[PDB]
Amino acid sequence: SMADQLTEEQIAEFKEAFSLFDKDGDGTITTKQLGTVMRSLGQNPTEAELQDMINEVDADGNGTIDFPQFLTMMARKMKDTDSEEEIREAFRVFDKDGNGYISAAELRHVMTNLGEKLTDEEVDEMIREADIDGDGQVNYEEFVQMMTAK
Amino acid sequence: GADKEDDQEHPSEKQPSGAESGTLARASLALPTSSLSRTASQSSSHRGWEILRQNTLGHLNLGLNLSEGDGEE
Ligand SMILES: [Ca+2]
Ligand SMILES: [Ca+2]
């Protein structure tokens, strides 16, 4: 299996189950629907297990699950690394929506707090400078690379 | 007497095609107006990513030039 790598083929594998109930495909389901999605994830685990999943995601208590919170739970099961935290938190400070990518606005928030003003041209070119694959956006492994290598 | 042929093709199309659900919208946007592309160099300093990680690490940084300029309350 390649689920641990969370390849595009695999992200689609569980997204399909999530979107089965979310007809609009917006990426939002309620915890009432998550129990039904849990049936699509496996062979009907005991209610305590089913409940444990809805309980952790509904930490907020709003009854509704946004898609990156669904991903946060799975990513943690696949990664299992406690020392990665020095870098992960740094990414989360600016990644408030949790979409896993860096936009120019996210860097603007951080640099402003220092009381310094990076030019908008520098912030926009930083994304292309960091990115090595031409997609116009930077993900977590690309962000780690920035400091751990030249 | 003189005469000329007459044609003028001008159709319009209303037959729908290419349908799909197409259901999407976005909650937030930035739309900066400060952004422009006058630079030819298009260079950017690694400081932009460095400053982010130094401040969340809590690494000590110090600057003097940031004092002169527009004030703040
Ligand atoms: Ca983001
Ligand atoms: Ca990229």
Side-chain angles (χ1 to χ4, degrees), chain A residues 25 30-33 41 99 103 126 138 144:
Chain A
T30 58
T31 60
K32 187 179 71 176
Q33 293 174 298
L41 265 61
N99 76 319
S103 63
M126 284 261 75
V138 179
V144 177

Side-chain angles (χ1 to χ4, degrees), chain B residues 38-57:
Chain B
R38 296 180 297 185
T39 184
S41 183
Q42 300 185 58
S43 182
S44 60
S45 177
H46 67 89
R47 187 186 299 177
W49 296 114
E50 184 184 1
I51 197 69
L52 187 174
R53 292 182 290 271
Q54 290 180 123
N55 78 73
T56 188
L57 186 294

Side-chain angles (χ1 to χ4, degrees), chain A residues 52-119:
Chain A
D52 188 41
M53 188 185 186
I54 69 168
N55 187 278
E56 291 301 309
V57 71
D58 198 15
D60 195 21
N62 70 321
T64 307
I65 305 167
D66 194 357
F67 194 82
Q69 280 64 61
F70 187 90
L71 296 176
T72 303
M73 186 183 290
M74 191 179 290
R76 187 182 181 181
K77 295 178 69 181
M78 303 299 184
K79 190 74 70 177
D80 196 43
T81 307
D82 295 312
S83 302
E84 194 180 63
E85 68 184 355
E86 296 300 315
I87 304 299
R88 301 188 301 173
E89 189 66 31
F91 194 102
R92 297 204 300 181
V93 175
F94 64 81
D95 190 25
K96 300 294 293 295
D97 66 342
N99 76 319
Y101 297 92
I102 309 174
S103 63
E106 298 179 61
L107 300 173
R108 194 179 190 82
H109 175 82
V110 181
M111 67 89 181
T112 305
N113 194 48
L114 288 296
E116 295 181 58
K117 294 301 189 298
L118 296 177
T119 58

